[model samples]
Target: NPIHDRTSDYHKYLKVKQGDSDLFKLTVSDKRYIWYNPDPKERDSYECGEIVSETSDSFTFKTVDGQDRQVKKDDANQRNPIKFDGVEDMSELSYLNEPAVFHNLRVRYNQDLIYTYSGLFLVAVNPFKRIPIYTQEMVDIFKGRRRNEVAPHIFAISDVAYRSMLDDRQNQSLLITGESGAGKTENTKKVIQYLASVAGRGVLEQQILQANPILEAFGNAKTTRNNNSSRFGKFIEIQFNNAGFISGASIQSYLLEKSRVVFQSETERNYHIFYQLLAGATAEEKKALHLAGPESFNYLNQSGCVDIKGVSDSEEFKITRQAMDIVGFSQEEQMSIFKIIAGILHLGNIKFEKGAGEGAVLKDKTALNAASTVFGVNPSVLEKALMEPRILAGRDLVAQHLNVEKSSSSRDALVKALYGRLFLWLVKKINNVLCQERKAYFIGVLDISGFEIFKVNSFEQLCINYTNEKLQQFFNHHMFKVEQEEYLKEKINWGLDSQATIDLIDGRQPPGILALLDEQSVFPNATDNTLITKLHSHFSKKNAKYEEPRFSKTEFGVTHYAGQVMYEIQDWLEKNKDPLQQDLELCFKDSSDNVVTKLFNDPNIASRANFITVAAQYKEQLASLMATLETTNPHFVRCIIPNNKQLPAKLEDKVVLDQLRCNGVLEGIRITRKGFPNRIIYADFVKRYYLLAPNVPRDAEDSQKATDAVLKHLNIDPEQYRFGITKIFFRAGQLARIEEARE
Candidate 1:
């Protein structure tokens, strides 16, 4: 006999079953069986046959493939397995001999068993198989227009989950996970796109669109890997009523990488806002604000590739203005933001002066100019704020005692306070634009750096990892019950565990790191020469393990140290210092109070707190909404996509080993198990066996009134299932009434 043509045999067998005479069917009984009714003398007679058995490692099955065969349970590929024939390799083929009804396809699968089943369309491998189609009826039901549908575009699976939840009046959350540069931010945008189109309910279109600019301006940047990277995570909540109309919406953002604002590497530029402020400001504007050109700032000037094509700082300013307008920021408030940015620019340009002998002093002529520009005051008024004896101390205590001798330290303290406040002001301004009410839900998209375990990591790398660890912990808390319980009960703040906050503020001393450095800051104390000097001194005295003394090399009268390595003062400092820059600096004043103050007031200091607050708020809101949903409600749909490509190995000359793998293994599990019927049904014939068998005939149609009886019993339009066998089988009396069977 002809080697069994899997597709043809399966089709013929299914055509003989009882059902609507359509050659294909989607529904079938959830039972496995091998028929024993075939001709007894034929080779097709069962030589070996065994029912399937379940085990932890694999599914075992008794088999009779022309000879007795015992398939071990562990023999199966744990990731994928075969089932019926023709379901495996259809690669190099189009939709299985069927006409395409829907232009865009969508298939849902059970996520729990998705990996084990060969049939479910794995998303990462074949991302496009599951496309949602907006039928006319569906559009009408949702009161949506056909023009509004953006279906051909690929969306993250989370978008589907969000849409399903919104449509069904249930809560939804999208959890996007991957290492950095894996397109998490782009995926987040696609999700928001779907939500905005479907959930807006005819309101807040402008607000929704404006939200992107406001977010990107404050929360995104161009990093080494991604051109457009989100520096924060956000959750957007769309509140809908029972009528399926959107009632309200809100947005919240998590950690913002603020350090990138002031300093960036040669390959990277400061945040877009800095460039926007610089490019948008005119020469006269810069002079009026006491801000020097970008070339004047050490960090900005050193960064070589700050300029990128199609990313004009001027254009960003325009976009920001439009976003601000949409968000309803008054012109005055907008100017306030610009004024703060300008002040930071001027701060970047500030110059310091050192005394001839021992102590270093900081000058504030540029700082005073910046203050006048931002606060609308004269140079003298700002001078009084910076230098006069009337400044307030901690807890509202007015210092009546004016010690002019400690002017350097006083200037340093004032500069730190001003810049610190400036950083906080920027956060408040951005939040003011996007935040509507206290109890709103926002979708947060985070695109921070991934774990960096390089050859030699340092304190900075440690801090970055510490921050990521906290965020990961946050994700775990929200996703798993056990983690959530541990977090609340243990009060385990991972940030503190990393010692990052303490390192930044308190330093390494008993109370603060700065205090240890302060001990060396005194006259005749070599440790007072540089911050690193104090650190080395403290470490050597406290810990015998650190035998090497911390030392710095002088360049242009400024000291720079070996950050990660232990150094001997005589050998390392002398060799490292550049003679030319050092000579020029030694000739000039070397006051570093200006730089020190800026470091203390770094905006990133408060970033962690702000992120924590935002994440918690969004998480709380999403949890509350999800709690109301029914357990059976469809929260997510996993689309089972078919691999139309052929497998590499061929098992038989007639069978085509590749085709067997594709049909029996891949397509079988997808159709039989995974709920994604759209693609498989259009591409395979398995469903035909179950749906059309009853209507087929085993004899001549003229003898049995096949047309009248089959049509009436199947309750289906005859024109839909036009396969020749479906019509011929009904005439032959092989198939029976579909009405008598339960679907």
Candidate 2:
């Protein structure tokens, strides 16, 4: 019998290795050979090539024409190798008991695969190049299947989310986060694509896809870490009906990197829209818009980072323009939008010098003329506004001559403000068109900035890291805090009782970093020296994580939970107290460009003292975002950057391991491992396994006795399974073994 079994496997392995359809399809007529038929029309059959060695699953095979065929147990040629048998759920893995094993397994899988599962978590590795795994055919395979049955993928997750929304009549959200170059943008795009494809890309679905290039044009840039890094945060809410079709959608944005409009590091470029217009304009169009080239403009030319690898700026501009047209931007409205962009570029190049008699003078009259013409304003008036210092003194308005430094700062402020308003204008435009209708349920995707620590940290870095820390805090609470909040029942919890971490950053105890910083913004004469001294007096206590290092006058350090960071607060007040130009307000306030004037509120811009602080605005927006996310079932997609270099087939252990450690992967494991991770309903357990204890009684009043009798008859180890009020909870693989024995 053993010899016969080994001989039978050899033929099957050889057939699979050679991809013979007859192996997959069996046909036999003999009474006893019917099970292993050689028929070509069989509806049910399987085959895999095995080696000629010795085992039943591996043995040499002979061909039908008297030829010998080489065989292997597992051949790559066997179509859909994972479809037959593979680990889709990481917890089902024997090595699941250890986080180290889980981490290594993820790395190994990424080295050779695209997706993996850790509990409900889906780890997607950026392939660096396009792969054919997300086709319509693949989508059909993953639809309506349990995650444990399919090869781990974002498609599986998206499908599950869609199904659950319809089944549970509730909303679902996918939270995607990671460092730069980790491909969250692409991941988000794929989720939307999968959703749209199912419904055959309805009208709103097509519009959502069409809006992507426009978003990237206005909100992404070339950075040191990524070729096309998004410079803003986006949460896309895709609306659906009970039928699970994409009915409508809305796009909400926050924290646009407006500072980059005025300055970027040596290796980074400003938002892509700036360069795209410069590189793509025709000679006639360029002359009318006053753009020479990317390097000819100060805002773009600075840092000498005009080129993006493998990206055609001119072509991209055309794409963005087409997308805008498709998104319902009228031709006249389009011209007005580009006029502001052109004016910002031209404004940057309009240099300054000390005036002959009283104030700063325009270094180049040509630049000023071009800038004013693009903004639909007069050159003389624009020059006066740029070089003048006009302050809001309670009820009195005052204007005075400004030095070259002050004049330069004013010019930069205008461009920075213009970019921020331009972005918001787009968001308002998109939301109105896409979200005018009501939706039954929505699936939102949050793709935001990850934590960043630079060699010299500043306000921007603080904001980015702060957003991440708050998100980390959310993850901390969502994962185990609710259950471990059991410590609440027992009345012993120590999460953040001893730390004033968030308070030190954004607190209001008398004032925190943001609170104190915003105070200087709301008033006048708050210089760096004066602000630092005031902060030192207020936060000198041990509870606050604030301390002023002796060596620096405009610097402070906070021992943030993620790491220690010393923030340079030199322009802290000015950056936050972003005053809209009174002159621009007066100019656009009554100008013919309704689209331009609509971008700002006249009252806020009419006076600096009336303007809101930047920190206050961001805090409000963050609060709104959190509220929208809290009422839904959430999933986490933690992307990992394998190395500093964004190269495929290259993954380093150091970079991979550090990210895991920082993101609290082990902490999550320690929390989930302490108790049972799975539970079976009492009714379902008894319905199938009551046969194990047929002698046991089945009565509602005596159900406790029946449950005990069944467990005793099944002889399950106490450690393997525990009984709750109305459920059976199993540890690790005990349930798997039980199901396997039942099957």
Candidate 3:
């Protein structure tokens, strides 16, 4: 029998039952029943009830609302025992189903306990309101404490990772993932903060903390779902020396939402930098850059939301500027960056109209002149680049005038390219300040967009969704496949896989969706219909992962791990090409400002081959990120938004469960339960667990034989463990039993 201590503090706090006094005492056999929706439409809706009578194959229960309900034995979802309520680890519960798991998390959430252990990863529910558990005192409390010794926390996870890296001499990574409003960015910051506090050096730790403000100002925005949503994916690697002090750091950013610079949905604002520059610039600076309020810019006013509630753009701009100073940006360099921001705002204001000829004309040169002044380029040259740039026509060079639509789009492309290049430059500058040449070890923290499936999924959604698909594949492969493969390698039995959906999206053997899209991108007469037709012809009935929607000819669907997402292919060709006229680059290449000159003239910008599509580049970057991740020990933190309303103290069960399903929290429990979740090598097992067995030598020559003897002596259930050739594997909660007995 397993030993569960009743007097320990952990038990007193979490194991003791609540709400079981007189209500259940009169039950026939003192049995408990879970309130569950019998209807499929209202799964999350529940109420507490008690079993009034039982039969051999059926039961009747009375709801707290005084209604008697009857159901078959299999129809009822049994509630866990009172002592199992509010468990720190859901894996330890006797009943491990969806409703049970949801109720456990709900119980803890009601107690204001936001962090809980779910199998291998940590589940973080967004408290919405501030909880004071993140203070310095909390950080100190988790230092050097084993995971079991402390409560579940971001700091506790960070401490374990730090200790593991130092003791095992292996690199570590914390992959914080969730949906848009799930608080991934906040959890990521807490991880870095905990590490810096525990192993900080002189100025490097402060610099590491300051990187967020600068990045947030440029890469975060206000969307309908979240106020301060991160629009880019970033991996911040905190490097350390041989002595375990943080020496330096480096950052890698991926798939920035550059299109947000020009277009934001209704009720959403553009990137924060535009607003910040407008609100924070001094009168002289504003006059010099020809700056105006957000209402003057097309990009900022299109969404009808100029500001977020309770936030001042001017105050954030000060923080961003201060962060830049700490991150080693010179005053001139900072001003140059601001000039680019102002230029982008002015570029958005440039209006195109039909000329006397078929070509387009700029009726007012006011916005053009202001943008040109800030970019240090001649207005006429910029206008020529925008309207009638020189192009190569089958080996001959000639000036071609674009129509109003083409010219407007061309201007928007230029703005997107300018902002994209500037974002890259800012990342490079921050990396230079943080990069350490002589680093011994590093801890990487990835804060990226979670899986998204909007109504009209576009190129940006595909890119981000595909990214998450790969990331989820990596997680599945690492957590389940690798663990089971080791079991099989040691001649035991286990299984699970998720490569089909991935192959449907990224495979190249028969050409997947991305490959087919890229193939269509090179065609001179290709239309969006042709692309959709091609996709349907290829994957309509041939692949199980892809579907041709019967109702919509313009859209195709892919069954991602999260759910079915239908993607509209209206602008796939143009979006994939992401074209920019060379004349625009040439104009900015010869600018008077050094930053502008560097952005356009660098060989890195010029050496890119036009044949490479956006999808191709993203695939390459994801491959590189995965390769780097493969070399490190990864820890997963899945942040859950309690409710869509963003209000505090309300946990919407359906919303929370969907994320749990999407982020693999539920799948993790399934695999963890079905397989051996804990393992110890023969030598390590004998070394740490031999004390419970009599006549077992401390340093046994044949550790495998010694481990077998120890397990038998301790009376470990044969069903609870299996013996491998080189190691001993235990089921989900078996290892804790032996440890409890020994202690």
Candidate 4:
């Protein structure tokens, strides 16, 4: 019976490889697959075909399209065995080609398996519908289970990070990046959820969970693609004590889309708070704040989209209020916030008209009075500040009368400034309640926008994309350069680069795009055209990343890691300056509302230097973010949007494939497969695997010898692992094999 079993069909076809390739080599005689380019013009396009015949130099294959083709063995790409298809870890595939990887993901995604491991990172595909994968029962399943024993899930990754932090006594970070409509924010919440459920203190846990509603109300909006899109960047650090209990938390926000307050695209809505206040306020509160329907306010009405499908602003407002209460906002503080929201709506209603002698004047003071009443400012002084702000002329201060265009633009600028500052104030307030003085370690979760390329990208897109570029470079350096250098230090060989694009965007030697924008920002005579010209002159033919569009004088292009995106240089100078008049600040500084006065008079807001440009501040913020990230052990998660329609069960091939290329998923696997990506220090390896090598003592003096003895005891394939100076390095999937054995 044993001899018959060895010669059975199961041994011929379905046998798993165990330090031997003889089975696969013999099976390939019956059938083989090769990846072929269906169309040579399309680089990322390929088709898998079965080889029908072979010659000395070439193999003839019949493609899925039923066409026969021939290709040289050296040029053809080998396909992995059927057993490797849809494997949870992509790096496990022997032939890590483009089509193979994409097909693997497609297979898994078709099965509603959204989370898959790609070497050192995770790739999450947005399902576009609710799934029962994230529930109490599911979290319980991943609890205390090793990665090899559990399915690929967000909870599993969070648990891995948590366990590593506790065991290694180091901090960790989950870096989540994806385009709008992707599931970056959703995944972030799940990470927090898993951590809190497993390691939380009750009251603080509730407070942490409640912060989301308050943040969403003021920071999220209904965009064309995503109903609840976050219009800002967030980095939330969950601090934990030495005993692995969460002690406290802190949040840092970046680049709120303040411009959305004054304007939105045709299908978009302003921040959720505006509609919430109008829809949910009590009659008495509405009357006191001079509120009306959303259509009554210009800000809310311009976009033509006030309500999101299946979402109730009134109900959301109640939740937001409860979240604020849970976060320790007093009733008076909450009311003051509502008053500011009301004041902004009224300000949006104030209309400017050309008056006598070309100086704009307000024909009706109703909206002005309403705004001033809510803000607790004198209407006359507010009107004066809007129409005729004082400016220093040479040696004497003079009040300058503004025309209709200047007055309205200045008004919009003030509104943007007010909302931006209020957002910052809100974040600071939340930090005051949540941040603790002493902590052992922290797990920072960065949920930010991925690479963006619209029909007309602007200053905001440039900044966000620049942030992503730096982040990608950080990933490249960490995942490639640092990894290889470590291998070299351990007597192994390896090589990688992406600093060029970064230099082109943020360099200061001869001035990159941001630096050049900052230079143009302070020039009184500079316009959008002048800024574009400056960019062309500096980097027209000098840098490969920069491209000056031939037909569009107002547009320049930067080739990001994602793709080449053409940016319209409209209002670059003004947007970069982001000026707020001293008169407007003075009007708000003495407001009767405590929150309003503090928002204006806070030293951080008041002490800002006039000449500092928005790009400069963003650059500084990014630098600070990078500095903080460099200190933590980071985990990367790349989310992909399956389709632009945001519907379930519809995945566009090109869409998913391009994102795979852009997010560095493919590249990550390519490099990961080439190198031994899974490594553990000798001591760590001995500590974890000494049971398999009982002959070696747990406290062996020579960890390297102990690790070698353990591998020998397990009879590990010589090709599957290597010994470094102080660590044991294993090829992709080798460590998982050992993990399975240990379990």
Q: Which regions of candidate 3 are displaced past 4 Å?
A: 1-29, 70-75, 481-496, 605-611, 675-743
Backbone clash pairs in model 1 (N, Cα, C under 3 Å; residues 3+ apart or in different chains), count: 65
TM-score on alpha carbons, each prediction: 0.46, 0.77, 0.87, 0.87
After aligning candidate 2 to the native by TM-score, how far in Å is the CA of 741 from where it should be? 17
Model 4 / residue 15 / CA error / Å: 21
Each candidate's root-mean-square deviation in Å?
Answer: 17.7, 12.5, 6.3, 7.3
For residues 549-575, what per-residue lDDT tens digits would candidate 2 score against the true structure? Answer: 878887877766556778777877877
Report the lDDT of model 3 for residue 314.
Answer: 92
Cα error of candidate 4 at position 713, Å: 21
> Order of candidates by TM-score, top first?
3, 4, 2, 1
Query: How does each model score on lDDT?
Result: 0.38, 0.68, 0.83, 0.83
- Please report how far candidate 1 places residue 530 from its true position, in Å: 21
- Specify the poorest-scoring 10-residue window by lDDT in model 4: 9-18
Greater-lDDT candidate between 2 and 4: 4
Q: Write model 1 residue lDDT over 411-503, tens digit each, in one string.
A: 333433334344444344444543446432333333334333444443333333434434433432332443244334533221222233323
